[PDB]
Amino acid sequence: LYFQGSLELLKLRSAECIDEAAERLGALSRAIWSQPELAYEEHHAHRVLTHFFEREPPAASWAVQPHYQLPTAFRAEWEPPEARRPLHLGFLCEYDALPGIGHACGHNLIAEVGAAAALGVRGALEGLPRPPPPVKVVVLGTPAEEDGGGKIDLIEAGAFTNLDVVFMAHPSQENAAYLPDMAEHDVTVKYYGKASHSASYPWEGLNALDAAVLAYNNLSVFRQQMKPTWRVHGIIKNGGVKPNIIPSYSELIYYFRAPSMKELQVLTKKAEDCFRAAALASGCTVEIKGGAHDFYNVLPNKSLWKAYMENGRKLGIEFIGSTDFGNVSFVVPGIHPYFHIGSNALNHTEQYTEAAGSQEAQFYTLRTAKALAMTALDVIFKPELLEGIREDFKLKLQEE
Amino acid sequence: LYFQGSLELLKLRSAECIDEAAERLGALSRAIWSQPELAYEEHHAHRVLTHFFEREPPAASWAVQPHYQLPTAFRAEWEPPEARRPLHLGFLCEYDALPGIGHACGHNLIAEVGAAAALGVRGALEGLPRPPPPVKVVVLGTPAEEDGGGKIDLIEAGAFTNLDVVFMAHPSQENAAYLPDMAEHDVTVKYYGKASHSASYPWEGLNALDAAVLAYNNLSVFRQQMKPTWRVHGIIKNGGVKPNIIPSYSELIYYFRAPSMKELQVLTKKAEDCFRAAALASGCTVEIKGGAHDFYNVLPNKSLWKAYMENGRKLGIEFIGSTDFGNVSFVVPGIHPYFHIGSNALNHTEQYTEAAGSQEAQFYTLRTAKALAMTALDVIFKPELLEGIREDFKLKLQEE
Amino acid sequence: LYFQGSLELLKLRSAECIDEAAERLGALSRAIWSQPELAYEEHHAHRVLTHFFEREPPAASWAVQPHYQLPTAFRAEWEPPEARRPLHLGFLCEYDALPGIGHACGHNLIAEVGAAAALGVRGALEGLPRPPPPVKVVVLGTPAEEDGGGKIDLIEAGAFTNLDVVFMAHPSQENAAYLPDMAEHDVTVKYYGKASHSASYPWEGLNALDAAVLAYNNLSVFRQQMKPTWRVHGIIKNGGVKPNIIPSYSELIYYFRAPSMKELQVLTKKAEDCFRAAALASGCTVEIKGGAHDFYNVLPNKSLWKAYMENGRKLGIEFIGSTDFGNVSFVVPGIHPYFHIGSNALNHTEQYTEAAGSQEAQFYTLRTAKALAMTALDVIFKPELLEGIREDFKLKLQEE
Amino acid sequence: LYFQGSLELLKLRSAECIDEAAERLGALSRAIWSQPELAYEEHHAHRVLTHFFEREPPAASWAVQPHYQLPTAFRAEWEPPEARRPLHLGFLCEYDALPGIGHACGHNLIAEVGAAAALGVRGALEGLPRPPPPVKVVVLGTPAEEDGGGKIDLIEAGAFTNLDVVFMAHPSQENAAYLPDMAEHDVTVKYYGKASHSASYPWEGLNALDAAVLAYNNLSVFRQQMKPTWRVHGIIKNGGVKPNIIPSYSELIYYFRAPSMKELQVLTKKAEDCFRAAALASGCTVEIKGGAHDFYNVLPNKSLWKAYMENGRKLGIEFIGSTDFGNVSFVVPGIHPYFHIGSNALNHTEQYTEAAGSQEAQFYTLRTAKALAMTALDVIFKPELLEGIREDFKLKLQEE
């Protein structure tokens, strides 16, 4: 309330700190939005974001590690200069675009919203007269969300093993503190047959294009027995070269989605039967190559969920795919809220690139960053909440 | 020529003996044609044919064994009453019809043409003043040509192991001393899945109807890589019962045809891959049940071929599927000529049943029986021809 | 409360009236359960249910019309003998079983629960000292729910045009005052080709079995672009007779489900394109015959929903396909709650027939009948609720 | 015989003239074989062949038109310098290779064999003491046989309207004066659908890849009802780009072959039904684009056939796809014999390129050129043969 040093006043300070930084946070968004870069190629965005934290006053108050494991990844850390285990709070920035249509998923706003929340938390804790509790604010630039999974590469380097809670936000069509993101497995299927002159001796050949079509048929009829939450999508990248030669090679690219890892394994095995059946029927051999990284479904955290919604409702927010944050949510208690930005456009469309760079989206982006920062303050000053967060994280890991 | 006892006069006598028997041979044809019976159910035809040979004068001059191994099969034998290894000459009678459309393959004429040729040979040898060479005229009633393969059942009982040459003729659209009949393998494919209520939990079921459709697709694309002489035809006998229940059972009936046994084995294995692939893709188990008897392609005999054509050309005959005679032709040197009967209709059509029972067909039937009988006389009185027949039979068995 | 003639005491009386009738209501359930009858063949169940209402004391106090439009349908009506528009309250009894597995949907309990609720309402209103408000209690026996749609035949005869509210309940695995039942369209697809002897001239034929398989393929790949709430299930009833004859006839039986009538029309047209495409590709002609009756989705009524849940919570009930009640819910404000009966078995399984006839199911059946009867009392004595029910019924009809 | 100026001596002179030119004709073959060029890109081969006829002594005795209508086509003409309608005898040179594997159809030998036959005819007629009959020897370089059909472009320019007979020869595995070459129709099929994000709203898209697969299925099952002489081969050139986007475009390339133009039209319409059915089933639109030129089957000429075989048998030759020569054979009486070149390799394989350039192939190439030249001499000095050739050409055009 009106008590000197209360949590409410701390939350107000973080909101005011975000407002004071609205101009340079908007410029940060525009710099990434105006120069769209693809997965692992976000060299400009990496330069803009490291420069941002390096320039925050006082200079070098943020400890910035550019090229953190990946060339376009970075890490920035701040903690109160006091010295009396410190709580580690992570905030993630995404910044890879989509081919042809630019930042059609609003990832420029994700970078902004993660940087704004971190600025808000530090600014709130700097205003604390008495020494603030030991806490480290960690910002992780995670490239290549749309392809590859940079968070997973960072997990593989141990970048998340010391975080207690992780925050980030994603723009979409509605405001929700959690949405069901599915597990994903990607696969490329290559069939190898035996070429033959179809005009002369076509019976001496093994038709790899037949294999591709029969695989497509195997999966298609399988859709009737798929769980309604399952998803299967694929294309025929290579279906032959010339009609006068029986195709001896074909290539399919597929991905499978299911709400749990156990269900994804079942769906993947069923699909493998479909691909291998097409080889048996056509006489070809088959190479089934899975993606470098399976993407996990996002583990919800009930305690973190309720705390964020309470903060958002105070801010005026009215509440109601797959991502590599799912892998993070399995190793660190996190929340991945989606927020509306003033547009009816759908993510991954040209019109969303327009909304993502719009002036209108700035208000909604900074508002959700305020909710994130205020929720981080909750975890810091409510040890009971941190316990419930960890208890919910433990029980959810058992259910898998 | 005009020499007392020459082969030409013997051939004339067989033709005159067939003419004298034209009335009762026609009645024999009509008795089978007017009472069509299916495979293994030819009880009337068996009664008519055994009575025919029993009644040939002098009574019991033909040694008749009714119910010879099969209930509707029979064997009739005659030899000159002299006594001085005897040459064994076989003539086959078929008499099973087709369901619904009667004797649409003219099998009533096959019975007639085999009985007429045997009568002609005996009548010719009875006119020989000097004792005739030792020869046994064997008539074999072979039921169930259109389904089952009664010749194969008779082969299994050793009925053909003592024959030196075998004769029969088949009515069709053109006159040919030999036509390419293919090897055949029949199969019934049953898929077993797991039933489930498609309205509630269809993902808990394994769709046996999917298996049937995927098998159909596997074979269909395979047709492009089939040898142009190969044939594949099949139906879906059972494709489900009710739409509200995921089908847990499906049944397909197929047959495969190829010009050689080696090619039939390759085609059958390729098809087995197609059927088993559908099980793998759908998760069902599969039971592939082959027919009781594989049907062999008909082995040609060049020496017997040329001799029959020379006889037919003298008679006015102008020369240009699968059958269990193919299995016979593998174990006994035989010929299976096709002959025109005065109609443009195709075998296995309703209009062929009309031609088969027509008065017009009698002339052509008795004419081809004359050619058969005259060719049997060639083998009897030309040991050089019997040698060439056996030499051609040996060399053809090596080529398989 | 404890006020002479309050609504609470009226609701208690209906519950006590149902308890007093527990024995004969159980016998009613067992009589239908032990003698399972299929759609439109429920002659025994019709006899049991008409006798039940005819025998309720005083004799002929229920006005019973046997053979009401359908031979196995009936109508029973009671109203207070006072005379001062009367409110018309309908209760539906179902009683058709499923082939082979008996009453695997618990329809014997539906008949019981509808009769019990009607008895409870009458018994409550008979205890009213002052003349009770004008109300007619209508019981409608609706045969053939699992096939045909007897409610629709009754709608076609105008049987529902004078009802203000309609009640019924359905046993399942969980307690819910409303569940999403989908709209359904049934279709039989017949393809007509041209027969030909596949061994001779298969190119002279038009393969109706190809048409069936190609239709199956057309729909199968279409599943990827179906809305996740859509359902398509079908079988190949006729896929050919003999493999030696190119099939000139094939038959498929399908049904389509969608949450709204507008979506069902879109899905049905898409499927019609798939069926007609198979005719074009194969050269066959196609006859697409829709079912006699399309089944509507069930229209929810919010006011009736909340009132029933409040009654059920007081009774201890803890709350969390397609039916011809959907067509009723479009013309009369109704509720179709599902209730647990003490078993984990799924509807339309053999083990559900066991639960449906179990002694355990009686307690849950009579408890839900109490909730229905108490909700009918709400509508009678709360004109504001009847207004909200009609307002919710109007607004829902606009949304379609 | 041994008569001064007989036809036999003229035929000997043509054979000796070909032998004397064996060295430079071999160099002609090697120049084309060592520098393989594709359809319409045979600039080197055009330069070599025009230089060849320009250099034949006396210089400019051959009237040579380079770049005759097509850039790589040419025309060369010689006639006896006497002057007294002249018979026009055409000889065709092909010289386009195949991509990657060079002259795997032996087209370098076709150019050689056409030039050698023309040289042989001129040399024979130059030795005639008395003025020779009026005859024009026309050589036509016809590029782009393997793709496009340069003969058809030349037909369209009227290049064949004044020829009375046309000769050429093609190397293969066996010697035959005529082989059944089929009519061909080529087609590219493009499907246009509606893109949609399969992860979000895949039901808002129309799957053009489905269309491609359904077309493949439509044609595949159609193979069972195809005439055994029909051929259908095609590939999926474009089957989608990324799996996350429902494909809105697909592309198939097919070709169809049948022995007659009437049968090709029937097969093409049946295939068009298959392609259009896939559009209807998937909701896409379809563009069916046929090739620039349909290739005709080769019309046989019996009189020319027998004359060439009689010449070849005297030379030691023992006798036993689709091409644009079929279109020529429809407008000019021609023969297109195939000849063995000393190898077991199949045309359009890497090992045939080895045989085509081999020293061994030269003997067989010059031998068949001798047969061609000797047959041209037959037509010149046998007006009865020219009549029978034209009579056979007329009667064959009626039968189509």
Ligand SMILES: NCCC[C@H](N)C(=O)O
């Ligand atoms: N990388 C984000 C999740 C995976 C998704 N299918 C994609 O590759 O975009």
Ligand SMILES: NCCC[C@H](N)C(=O)O
């Ligand atoms: N039995 C005669 C040969 C086999 C043939 N497919 C049939 O069953 O008629």
Ligand SMILES: NCCC[C@H](N)C(=O)O
């Ligand atoms: N009749 C109840 C709804 C329709 C359902 N598919 C059935 O026929 O059972």
Ligand SMILES: NCCC[C@H](N)C(=O)O
């Ligand atoms: N041009 C020769 C005939 C046509 C053949 N399919 C090809 O394109 O090679």
Ligand SMILES: [Zn+2]
């Ligand atoms: Zn995205």
Ligand SMILES: [Zn+2]
């Ligand atoms: Zn994103």
Ligand SMILES: [Zn+2]
């Ligand atoms: Zn037959």
Ligand SMILES: [Zn+2]
């Ligand atoms: Zn037959």
Ligand SMILES: [Zn+2]
């Ligand atoms: Zn039911």
Ligand SMILES: [Zn+2]
């Ligand atoms: Zn039910």
Ligand SMILES: [Zn+2]
């Ligand atoms: Zn070629």
Ligand SMILES: [Zn+2]
């Ligand atoms: Zn060629």
